[PDB]
Each structure stands twice: as structure tokens, then as C-alpha cells.
Design an enzyme around this catalytic site. Sequence first.
Site, PDB file in Angstrom:
ATOM      1  N   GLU A  59      -9.389 -55.851  -5.513  1.00  0.00           N
ATOM      2  CA  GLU A  59      -8.463 -55.602  -4.416  1.00  0.00           C
ATOM      3  C   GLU A  59      -7.345 -56.633  -4.402  1.00  0.00           C
ATOM      4  O   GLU A  59      -6.183 -56.299  -4.148  1.00  0.00           O
ATOM      5  CB  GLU A  59      -9.201 -55.615  -3.082  1.00  0.00           C
ATOM      6  CG  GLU A  59      -8.318 -55.271  -1.907  1.00  0.00           C
ATOM      7  CD  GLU A  59      -8.883 -55.762  -0.596  1.00  0.00           C
ATOM      8  OE1 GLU A  59      -9.136 -56.977  -0.478  1.00  0.00           O
ATOM      9  OE2 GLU A  59      -9.073 -54.931   0.318  1.00  0.00           O
ATOM     10  N   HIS A  60      -7.680 -57.895  -4.669  1.00  0.00           N
ATOM     11  CA  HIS A  60      -6.655 -58.928  -4.724  1.00  0.00           C
ATOM     12  C   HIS A  60      -5.634 -58.633  -5.810  1.00  0.00           C
ATOM     13  O   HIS A  60      -4.426 -58.755  -5.586  1.00  0.00           O
ATOM     14  CB  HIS A  60      -7.300 -60.288  -4.965  1.00  0.00           C
ATOM     15  CG  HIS A  60      -7.579 -61.053  -3.714  1.00  0.00           C
ATOM     16  ND1 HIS A  60      -6.857 -62.167  -3.348  1.00  0.00           N
ATOM     17  CD2 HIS A  60      -8.498 -60.862  -2.739  1.00  0.00           C
ATOM     18  CE1 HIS A  60      -7.322 -62.633  -2.203  1.00  0.00           C
ATOM     19  NE2 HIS A  60      -8.317 -61.858  -1.812  1.00  0.00           N
TER      20      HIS A  60
END
Lengths: 445, 32, 417, 31, 270, 55, 55, 98, 52
Positions: A59-60
Site C-alpha cells: 500500500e505504501h
Amino acid sequence: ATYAQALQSVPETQVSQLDNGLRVASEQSSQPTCTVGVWIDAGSRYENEKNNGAGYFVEHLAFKGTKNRPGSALEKEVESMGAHLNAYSTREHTAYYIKALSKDLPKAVELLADIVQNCSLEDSQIEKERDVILQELQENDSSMRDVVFDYLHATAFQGTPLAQSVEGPSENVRKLSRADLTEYVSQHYKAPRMVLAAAGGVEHRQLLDLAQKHFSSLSGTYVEDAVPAFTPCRFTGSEIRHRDDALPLAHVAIAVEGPGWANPDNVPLQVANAIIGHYDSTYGGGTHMSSTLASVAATRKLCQSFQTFNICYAETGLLGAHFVCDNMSIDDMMFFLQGQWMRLCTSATESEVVRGKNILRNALVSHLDGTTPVCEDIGRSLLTYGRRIPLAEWESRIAEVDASVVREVCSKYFYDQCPAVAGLGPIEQLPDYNRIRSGMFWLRF
Amino acid sequence: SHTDIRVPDFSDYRRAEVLDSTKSSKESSDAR
Amino acid sequence: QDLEFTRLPNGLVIASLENYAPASRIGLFIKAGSRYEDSNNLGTSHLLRLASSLTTKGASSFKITRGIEAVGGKLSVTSTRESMAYTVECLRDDIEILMEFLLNVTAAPEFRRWEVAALQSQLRIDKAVAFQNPQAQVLENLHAAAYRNALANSLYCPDYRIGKVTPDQLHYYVQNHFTSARMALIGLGVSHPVLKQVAERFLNMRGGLGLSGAKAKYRGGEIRDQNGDSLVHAALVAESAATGSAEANAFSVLQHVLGAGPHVKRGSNATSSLYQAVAKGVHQPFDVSAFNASYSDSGLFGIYTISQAASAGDVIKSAYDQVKTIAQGNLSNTDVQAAKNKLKAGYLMSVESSEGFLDEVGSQALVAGSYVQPSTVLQQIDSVADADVINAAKKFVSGRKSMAASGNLGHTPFVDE
Amino acid sequence: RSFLCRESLSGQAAGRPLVASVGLNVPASVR
Amino acid sequence: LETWNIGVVLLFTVMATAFMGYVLPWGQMSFWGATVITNLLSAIPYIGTDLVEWIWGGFSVDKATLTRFFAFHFILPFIITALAAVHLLFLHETGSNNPTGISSDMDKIPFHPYYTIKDILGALFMMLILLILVLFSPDLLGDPDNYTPANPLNTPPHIKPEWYFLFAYAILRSIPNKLGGVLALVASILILILMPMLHTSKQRSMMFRPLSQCLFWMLVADLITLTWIGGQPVEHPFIIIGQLASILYFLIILVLMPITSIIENNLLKW
Amino acid sequence: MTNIRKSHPLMKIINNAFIDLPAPSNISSWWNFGSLLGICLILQILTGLFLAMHY
Amino acid sequence: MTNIRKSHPLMKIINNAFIDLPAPSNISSWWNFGSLLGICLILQILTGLFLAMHY
Amino acid sequence: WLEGIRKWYYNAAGFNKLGLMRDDTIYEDDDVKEAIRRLPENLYNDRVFRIKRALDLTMRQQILPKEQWTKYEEDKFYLEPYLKEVIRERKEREEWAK
Amino acid sequence: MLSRFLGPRYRELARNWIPTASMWGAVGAVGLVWATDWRLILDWVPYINGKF
Ligand code: HEM
Ligand code: HEM
Ligand code: HEM
């Protein structure tokens, strides 16, 4: 136009499905904006101890760079049309949604296709992102509610993938190389376990053809054979106490096993939960709130804030309460809070059940206000229930709930069930687990 | 650091039925 | 299925929209707030905001709380420096009961002595909770150091008035600033006729324009406080225009040209010129954003900055230099188009939620007095040219400044440099 | 919350005038 | 409420202890009063007879009952002491009530320098009365027939209990129904339990309630009348006077006092 | 450094009982009977003992 | 409103002396005798009284 | 007529002799205690002083001279509105709990 | 007093607690018969009556 008339007039949730498996679901309205996002079934539950924290890392790195958009260029496209791009990863679901105008729909869907698919995952950015997560871990350590809830999950579903935190231990995040993440992407970011949702000024036909022309490259296979299965998670009633007397306020969360996303018993229990209510020191209701616990807390200035939760996973959940209070109140609320639950397990008046039904209806109708909450609802419902529950069905299920139903369901889930206490801060006064378990049953009943 | 808090294994003291990833805590709750 | 905007002879503007939504929100927006607080009644507005549940004329506190909770409705009193917005939400089949409750609370309170004395502690509790966010302290000291009076007054009761706000002050505030002319009744999910009936039934008792407050004067000072926080929260502003003018729209566009608020979660704000300019420079955790505040008579525009204690002097400087570059004519039309698109999206996206639409209609009714559809707002935004933005930047740069800071100010520069 | 990162610190600045709000069953909020 | 109920319990315990103590010296009065009083429990339905044979430790007040009553008379006063300690605890949780009936939290004085010496004076006066009684006229409150060895084959001319019990004994004699007599005997003391409930006056005390004052003194005169009636034999006109006094006692406590308080509040705008 | 009257446990109980207990100022003589009961009780506990020693 | 166990006067003493008294968690069996003695005392008070009714 | 009986009763009650007003003699239950708390400061101070003077007089078993007796006509009714409001609120609470 | 406790939801609470209170009373009755060894009742229970 009465309530009932308005409910059967809410736009529908047209649902489609491409050949690869990606479910397209839209909800037209008249607003000039839109909210389009992809809800994958990734999360900490689908993660072994070796690679726990992969989802957070992915997600980052999602918005960092792509093969087509090398990097900051993606951010430039997102900002140039005024869209806000966001992503939230939980223990069960991970989603990306773009909040943009209706006219920018063809571009927004393309942007989401690029992120979920042609993600770069450059090693240099991985190294840069490694420190950020480590800092965010300390920030979360400062977030005392979050650490208490992670303690709840760790001590309740011990020895199961659910006990794993979403971010992951601050040892896995320091060894997660490119290889581990790539398997996560290729093994969880699959078309069948994906829902392309949108709401607002969105046309279902437009969303379908955009999906057909963009997400067609999505694969439904699972490489050689590896198909990550669903592992049922045991709930082991336990307790954990991280006593840190330096902390000004004490957080205690206690929850028993609640149902899954199925098992319509959620609707009665939520009503029961609504009867317990929620309080904060800055409410203003004071010693007049209908909720007995709230009135007592306001009268005696017992706690600073107590909130009841019904966290719900695919096959099991944590249904209960979480309160923040000083050192010399923790036991007292344990007396009242439990004392409240058993009341609903032994004598729940129809008046308070009607009140809880009204509160639940208000919560449901208000939570679905705005394009982004609607898109979130569609994406979450298609993964949990397999279909978006229309508000009329919610109204019917709430109407079928009465005093006897609430009493039965509470006695089935609350009465004489071992809890999952988890405490942090100056929690010395917190009653011993034997005392809590004893308080879980009443000697009058 | 809170993510590094892992409950130690209690399989030595755990009671017969509740000893697996299978749910075993709802259906076997009544038995115990 | 449209927005009617009737105005009564008293001055009340009733706006109502029937969206056929399952829920309904009714909001009473009164042109009262901190700006209408003299030097002797400071903190009265905060207590009035907190006194949304005290025993009214025809409804006791117990009845009010129980009646709102049985329906499951909510009663908020969202307030600003220039307007107080009472708001009640519940199911459309029950909106009449809480309409009566709201109308009793706003038009016929009693302010019993014991209940106000009890609320005095909630004053301090709310002030502390709101001040736990550093932005609150800095934004308050910003107005305190920018405006001589009026807008300078805080939304929160000053510490010396905690426990001293007499009920007589509350009664004076009500029957001086809650008159029909300075109020607006907005309804989402309700029909216009019933709104008119409740208006002319309850709000007609108080008439006239009420006691008008004074204007705001730009003092242009500093309020710097040291409070140990590692992060320095600086805010350097200058006198911008007032909302409702082309200059206000020019300043709004300048805000997005400079960059305000991230758009990609955990992003880098590529288009934000402030963030990029500061990035060349301090390699440390920070944040810088344009800051626009538009009020009735005046307004502020400047830079808000969160930074490390040691590097703050750079972040205030470098970011400021960036605006200088815009003032000297370094604004490409592409950035103007990007800012206009961002502004149009931000406006259209704040009216998305029913609460957001309600607040927008309330603000339009209170300030201007006539509803404007979003299409006209976008047209006005597009009417802004590059020369207007370039100026707006000249006005910001070549004007008296106003700085409010926080944290360890060892290296934070003063407004003179 | 303690902020010690650019990404987490992003958005914590203010660009609109402060606006407080309290309720009856909703906790206090500010923006 | 707590102190009053504890006081009622103490009253019952003290009365039982005194009864057993008077049984101890085994005089004619002792033996025959013990038989008469214990035989009341035969009126209790079902278990009653068994209960008597239980307490008698046999078939009549005899060797077993004497030692049994000795042991009980020894143990009971320590239970009374424990209950008195609990009573003082409960009273201290609220503080004493002044004659005016109004809360006196403003005019409070330390106990030691004042009420210790006041209590010393009270103890001196009570010792004066008690020592006068013992030294000058010891057999004034007793009965001479108690100075005769207990002979179960002959009864004394009169069977009367100790004086502090006659007020209740007369009530016993009022109702021909033996079970009703026992029930009235118990209720004569248990009425104090209901007394806090019957309080209807807005004021607390009787300082400012002249009508209730006359009612209270009517009650005291009624108790004295019952005490006098208890001594005299069951003959005209003591029988009818005893019935009138017993009726009037409950009539005053249960009906006359609450109705008087109701009229009372109305006479003062509240 | 403190009064053993109001710090020693037994002495603290005695102090709160009948040394520094706040009593009403206008308590009439009718209240004395309270203690007149306890004293009687003590006497009754006393003499009875010396009776049970020859009975 | 409040728990009787910790608000009632007598119940407060009972709670603070037998219910919520913080005791060490590692006291061996040798600490049980303080209880037994008390129980023995009760038994001695009890049976002896029943001995007093026929002695 | 009736008011003559009421005046006779006020005279025979005796709380006028102590300087007390009618409301000072009321029993302090929970409702009355809350009403007393609700009193304005100036009324509360006079209430406390009147009560303390009365307790002093009863301690010394005396009464005020005839001139300083609270007359029936001058017997104000200060606690009555607050007690009435408190009773009304309690009745509302009980009815809602019904 | 009785004016306050006479309510719809009050009778409803009474109804809710009727089973528990009634079979608490049954508990008391059985315990009384047992401890007292009430022969009048115990002569009818099949197995136990063999004791007498
Ligand atoms: C064993 C005998 C008793 C002893 C030793 C005893 C002890 C005391 C003492 C010392 C006091 C404080 C002094 C006083 O106010 O009189 C007191 C107060 C009180 N006692 Fe007793 N008492 C006994 C019997 C009773 C009885 C039988 C009752 C009534 C049922 C009772 C009810 C009260 C009350 C109501 C008070 C408070 C008086 C007040 O506040 O004005 N007591 N008790
Ligand atoms: C509660 C306080 C007590 C009261 C009211 C009380 C009352 C009495 C009475 C009325 C008698 C009969 C007196 C007579 O013969 O005319 C008596 C006798 C006796 N009491 Fe007590 N008593 C009390 C406490 C005690 C205690 C504590 C003991 C034991 C230590 C005791 C031992 C005796 C004995 C041995 C007798 C027989 C001697 C005799 O009758 O003269 N008494 N008591
Ligand atoms: C402190 C606790 C007590 C101890 C240690 C104790 C000890 C004894 C002992 C060793 C005997 C001799 C038993 C025999 O030789 O057969 C005895 C006898 C007796 N005790 Fe106790 N006793 C206690 C409490 C009591 C109490 C409270 C009473 C009175 C209620 C009582 C009444 C008697 C009687 C009447 C006897 C004579 C009958 C007999 O010898 O068994 N005792 N006691």
C-alpha cells in the site's frame, strides 16, 4: 414522502462481472463528482508470520511509481484534475479509491488500473519506504487506542493470522525485500478477489466498458498451484496487561466472540450495542443521556470516553466495549459495563429496544451520505456479503428485532462467555480475569 | 513496538478440545 | 426537487430542498459568534455553543436529551468566528419533534443559574480538548496578532473567564445577536411550507437586525509562545480581501497555486509549489501550505508551516521566497489551470455530503442572502485571470504581516526579517 | 499523536480558518 | 432507616435476653411465666407444637430448659454489644438528629469537651436512680412470689411477667384468638419497622407539630394504660379497658398519626 | 509526625467515634439515654459475670 | 449508581477485609492457618455453646 | 373562617418564636437537599444563619423576644418555587422511566 | 412509591423475571423440603420415600 417511501427510491447497486472475474459495481446519482476504487481481499489475515507486513508495504509503494507512470508523474496527473487519491489497508480488505469529478472518470479508472497491476516496486523506493513504516510504527505506538486494539486482536485470536497486526512487527518490515512483496501482489491482487466500485455521477455502462478496456489484463490464475485458502481463526478468551504507569490515562478494551459478516445476529447485537451507547467527556448530554452507562459515567465523572464496537470478520468478530478512564475508575466501569450487558441478557425493555432500533437506523442512513462512503459501502459489501444490502432490507431486519430477540441473542453471545480483556496504562485497578469472568454471569439469573 | 507483542504459546496448558486453528471455541465452549 | 429561497418580512431566509433522502437535517445559522463579543463578555459565545442542551422554556434538559435520543437524532452547534450553526439530523418521519426542540433551544432559552454553573467546567474541558491540536493555538494567536478586535476574539472562553460567564451575559447575547434578520433557516429533506410554519411560529418573537458588531482592524503584530513541542507551527499572514469579491476568488486561486493540502495519501505534493520549493533546502520532516481565511469584512492570506525546531528559520524563509517569485510574474498558465481545477473540485466536493451542502447554503444565506448554484461558482472561478493572482501575490508580499508561532522558537525568525 | 515523518506530517497544516463544533451525542470536533 | 431497624433488632434481642434472665433464678414467677410465654409458640400453625417441644428441650419447662436458657442468656448480650457497635457505625455515617429536626451541619461542636461531660452527668443521674432502687427498695419492681421454690404442681395466685413486658402482655390478652394474640404480640414491636414508612408530615420532628404532640402523648398514656392492665387479672372492667387500649395503640400509630400529619401539612400551605 | 490520636488505627476509630465526632449543638438531654443504655449494658455484662461465678 | 459492596458501610468493611483485599500472590500454604484458627475459634464458640446447654 | 385557623396554627407551631421561616423547618430529603443547593447565594446565607440562630436558641432553651417573631403575613415562601421545580423534574424522570 | 412502580415497562420487567423468580421459589421449596426432611411431601417421591 415517508421514510419507507424514500428507502425504496434509493438508486440500485447494479453489479456486473467481467470474464476474468473482476466484479464491477456502480451506483448512479446526480452529483457531478464520483468515487471510484478497487477493493481487494488482501489484509493481515492472508499473511504468514514470515511476510507479515507485506500488505502495508505494498500500500505504501502503490502510489510511488508505476511502469507506465514513472513516479511523481502519477501524483501530477492525480492533482491536475483535483482528485484526492487515498488507500486504506485493514486486517481483511485493502482498497484504493480516487475521489474525482464525473468527467474525469475515464482517466481515474485508468489510474487505478495502473496502480493495481503495473506497480513498479523499485528497490530504491523500497529502501526509502522502509524507514517511513518504521517511523509510522513509533507514531502508532504513541496512538494508545490503536495499540490497545492490537493488543485485543493479539490476545484474542492468539496463534492465528488475525492476531497479526496490519503494519507487522518492526522486524519483518526491516527484511521485506522486493521478492516477498511481488509474491504478495501476484498472489492476492487477483481479478476474482477484486471489486471495482464507483458512486456519484457514474454510469454503470461506462464503468463496465472502462473496466473491460483497462482491467482485461488482470489474471485469475494462481501461478503454479498456490491458492491461499481461508484459515478459520480460533478465539481464545484471554487477557493482556501492558501496565505503564507513566501514561496519563488507562485504556481497557473487553470483547467477546461476535458473529461473522454472515449470521444476521449482527442486526440484533448492533441494536443491543446501540442500547449501551457511547460517551465522551465533551458530549454535553451529561447526566441525562438515555444510556445507563453514559449517564452514570457523566454523573460520577467516571471515564473520559467509552465506545462500544462490533468489529466483524468473515467467520468471527470481537463484539464489546473499549473505555478510557483514570486509574481509580477501571474497576468501577468493569462493574457497570458488565452490569449493563447482563441487563440486556436478562431484562431488555421494549422501549430501549425501540430506541436502539432508531439509533441504528440513523447510523446506517447517515453513514451512507456522500459519494466516498457509498463507494466504500459497495466495495466492502461485495467482498463481505457478496451483494450490497439495500437499505430497505436493513430496515426490515431492524424491524424484526424486538426485546425478546435482543435478549436471546445477547444471552447467546454475552452470557457466561469468556472475554478477551486487553489493558494498557495505569491499569492496576483493572479487575483480575477471574473477577471479570465471574462478572460475566449473574447469580440472580 | 506494539506490533512486536506476540502472545507466548499456551499449548502446554491448553485444554484438549481447544488446540487448533479450527474454531473449537464456540461448539466446545459448552463442553468445557 | 429544487432549492427555494423565500425571505420573510422579518429577515429570516427560509431555504428548503426536498431531495427525498431517508434522513433530514435542519440547520439554523445565526450571524453570531466570537466577533460579536466585546471586551467584557468574552467567552459568552463558547458557553452558548456548549449550552445546546440546557433547560429551555417549553422543554426541560431531560426532555430535550431523551427526545433527541429516542429518535436517535443528533444536535450539533458548529460555530466559527462569524456564525453559529445549530443543526439537527434525524429520520424524515420524525423531523418535526426535533424541529420543535431546536426552535426552543435557539429562540426561548432560560439559562438557569445552576445549569450554567455546571457548564462552567465543560468550558475548560472542551477548551483543553480542542487545544490538544497545536493548530488550534496557533490559529487563535494568529487572529489575536492580526486583528485588533472583532475577529481577534477566540472561539474558546479565555482562561480568566472560566467560571465567570453569568447567565445575564448569555441572555444579553441571545436577545442582542439572535434576531430574525441575522438568522437563516435551512432544510435538507424537508418541504418548504412546514419550514415556513415553524419559522413564523417560533422565530418571529425576536425581530430587527440586532446589536451590530464593530469592524476588524489589522494590527499586524506577533504572538509567539514557547511550549516545548519539538515541532514549530509558524503562520505568517497578511490582509487579503473579504469574501464575495473578485479579489477573494483571486486569493483562493493563489492558495491552490501555492499548494494547500495533500491529494495523494503519503504523497509528495508535486504540483504544490510551496512544498517543492521548501524541499530544495530542508531535508527533514516538515509541512508547508497556503492558508486562506475569508470573513465578512476582512480576510487573511499567508503560509502555515510545521517544521523541526532548528530548521524552522529556513522553512519560513524559503517558502516565503517562493511567493515572492510568484509576485514578480513567474506564474505559468498551466499552474493557473491546475489551481482552478483543484479549486472547482474542492468546492464541488465540499457540497457532496448533505451536511456540507447544508453548511454551504447556510453560509450563502447568512453572508450574501441569495443561493448560488455550483455552476455559477465555477464560472466565477474561471473568470479569474493570471494577472489577478499575480496582484493578489503582490498584495500579500507588499503588506503588513502577522506572525503566530509555537514550539521551541530558538531559531524561528521574527516578522521584521 | 507524535509526528516524525514527512508523509504523516502531510496535511497537518491549516489552510482554512479554525472552526469548532460540539454536539449532544457526538464528540467535540475542530477544523 | 438503617439505625432504626438495627435498633428494632436490638430491642428484640434485649427483650429475649431479659426474659431468659428472669427465668434463671427458678422462682415461682420464673417457672410459670416461662411456661406461659413459651406455650404461645404452640399457637403457630403446623410446626408450632414441635417448636415448643424443641425450645423446652422436652415436654415442659424443666432441667433442660433452665441450663439452655442460662447458656442463651450468657451468649446473647455479646450479640447485643456487636449490634450496638453496628448501630453506632450506621448512625455515624449520617450524624445525630437535633430536637428541631433540621440539619445542623453548620452548628456542630466536637463531642469530647462537651458531650463526654454531659454523658458523665447523665450516668451520674442514672446511677443515682439505680442505687436508690437497689439500696433502699430492692424488691419494689419485682414480685414477691418469685421468692418461692418453683413447684410445677401449684401455681401462684397471679401469673404476671416482669413490668417492662406487661405493655405487650396486655395486648396478648386482648384477642381471644390465640394465634391472633401471638401475631399481635409480635406486631406490637414490629410496628417500629413500619413507622418510618408511615411518616407523612413535611417536617421531620414533632417540635412544631402540636397535634402530633397530643397524639404522641396519647400513645404514651396508652402504653402506660396497657402496662397497668397487664398486672390486673382478667376481670371486669380490665378486659374491656384492655381491648380499648390495644385497639387505640394501633389506631394511633397506623391511622391517627399519618392522617394528623396530612391535615398538618395542609394547615401550613404545604 | 502526627497525632497518634488520629493516626493510630484503634485511636483513629475512637477519635471518630466519640472524641472529634461532629455532634449537633442543641442536642437535648433526651439523647443522653443512648449512652445510658450502653453503660447499663456494660453494667449488665459486668454484674452478670460475677453472678455466673456463683450460679 | 454505585456498587453496594463498596458503598454500604458494613459491606465496605467486609469488602476491604475479605473480598478486594490485596494479598500477595505467592503466599504458601502456611498462610492458610490464620484462616483455620479463626474457623476453629468459631467452632470452639459454637460447639462449646451447645455444651453449655447441658452442662 | 379557615385562615383564622391557619393563623392560630402558625402561632401554636412555635417555629416563629425561633425566628425560623416556614421553609427552614422542612425535612431535608433528596429533593429538598437539591432544592437548597439550587438556592441563590443571598437566600442561602440567610437560611443558614437563621437555622444556626435557631439551633443556638434551642441549645440554650430560649426564644427570641416577641418583637422579633416571624409574623404570619411576613412569612415569605423562598424555597417553594425551587422545591416545586425539583419535584416537577423528578416526576418527569419517573414518568419517562415508566 | 407504588405510583412510580406501576408502569408498562415495569410490569414487563416483572414478566421477564417471572421465570427466574418462580423457579428460585421452587429451589427454596425443594431445599426446605430436603433440609427439614418434610415427610409429608417426601412420601410421594418414588426413590426417596424408601428411606422411611
Ligand atoms: C441496645 C440498646 C441500644 C443502644 C446501646 C443504643 C445506642 C445508641 C446510642 C449510643 C445512640 C446515640 C445517642 C442517642 O442519640 O440516643 C443511639 C442513637 C439512636 N438509636 Fe439507639 N441504642 C439502643 C437501642 C435502640 C432502639 C431500641 C432504637 C429504636 C428502634 C434505637 C434507635 C436509635 C436512633 C434512631 C438513634 C439516633 C437518634 C438521633 O439521631 O436522634 N436505638 N443509639
Ligand atoms: C443484656 C443485659 C442483661 C439483662 C437485661 C439481664 C437481665 C437479667 C434479669 C432480668 C435477670 C433476673 C433477675 C432476677 O433474678 O430477678 C438476670 C439474671 C441473671 N443474669 Fe442476666 N442480664 C443481662 C446480662 C447478663 C450477662 C451478660 C450475664 C452473664 C455474664 C448474665 C447472667 C445472669 C445470671 C447468672 C443471672 C441469674 C442470677 C439472678 O437471677 O439473680 N446476665 N439477668
Ligand atoms: C477459645 C476456645 C475454646 C477452647 C480452647 C476451649 C477448650 C476447652 C477444653 C479443652 C475443654 C475440655 C473438654 C474436655 O475435657 O472434655 C472445654 C470444655 C468446655 N468448654 Fe470449652 N473451649 C473453648 C470455647 C468455649 C466456649 C466459647 C464455651 C461456651 C460457649 C465453652 C464451653 C465449654 C464447656 C461447657 C465445657 C465443659 C464440657 C466439656 O468438658 O466438654 N468452650 N473447653
